[PDB]
Amino acid sequence: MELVVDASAIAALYVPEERSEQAERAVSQAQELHTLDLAAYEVANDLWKHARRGLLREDEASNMLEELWEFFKALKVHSYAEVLKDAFALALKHGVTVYDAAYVALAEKIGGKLLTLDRQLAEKFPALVT
Amino acid sequence: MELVVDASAIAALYVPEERSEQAERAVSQAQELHTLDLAAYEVANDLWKHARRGLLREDEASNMLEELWEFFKALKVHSYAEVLKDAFALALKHGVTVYDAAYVALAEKIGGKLLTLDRQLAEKFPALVT
Ligand SMILES: [Ca+2]
Ligand SMILES: [Ca+2]
Ligand SMILES: [Cl-]
Ligand SMILES: [Cl-]
Ligand SMILES: [Mn+2]
Ligand SMILES: [Mn+2]
């Protein structure tokens, strides 16, 4: 099983975090983890929000961003060129953002599934989500 | 002059659109245009919004996304790996999003300037923006 992990899924893995048994089994059993270039910015941005809200010290958030960087080396990172056209058509059809549609496009492309903690996304693509 | 164009700047160029004399002179005089992988998703997402709001027919929005794709071949497209660490530190320091900070990080990296139609962004980096 090829497994796409979006930004919410990476956030739960790259540092110690609580995860459903379901999430863990998917990651555990995957042949390989895949994501998009996009996820790097999305995870980093969520880290920025946490810092500015006073939940992380600035040096602590900077250290975590190093860890994210190191985590990304264990991922197969795909580019926008591979999915952009499919992502847009999926966004138009299903009424989800191109950002979200992109991960679904990628799961389809690699013949795999998507792990997302986004329940709303997960409901729109039952055949593609774990 | 190396010129970074963000998503708002690409939107004004990849199809016939009104532009300030200032924007035109910057693009005209640039040695080369540069952007991020990120901009592809951001422009496509803005196109999706326009379609869903009833401003573009679905086939018309799909044709424009083809044009965007063809436009991107004239751009030097840089990846998240080149800017992510700088983008985060700039986001923390200046109180802007990692998404925005990324283009500024890229202008700095290539020794060039940034063309953005985002006045708020443009005010935070006067030395880096056209
Ligand atoms: Ca396709
Ligand atoms: Ca640097
Ligand atoms: Cl916030
Ligand atoms: Cl909208
Ligand atoms: Mn979401
Ligand atoms: Mn903006």
From Swiss-Prot, chains A, B:
EC code: 3.1.-.-
Regulation: Inhibited by EDTA.
InterPro entries, A to Z: PIN-like_dom_sf, PIN_dom, PIN_Pae0151-like, TypeII_TA_RNase_PINc/VapC, VapC_family
Pfam assignment, any one: PIN
SUPFAM superfamilies assigned to the protein according to its UniProt record, in alphabetical order: PIN domain-like
Keyword Oxidoreductase attributed: no
The protein's name in its UniProt record: Ribonuclease VapC3
Organism of this sequence: Pyrobaculum aerophilum (strain ATCC 51768 / DSM 7523 / JCM 9630 / CIP 104966 / NBRC 100827 / IM2)
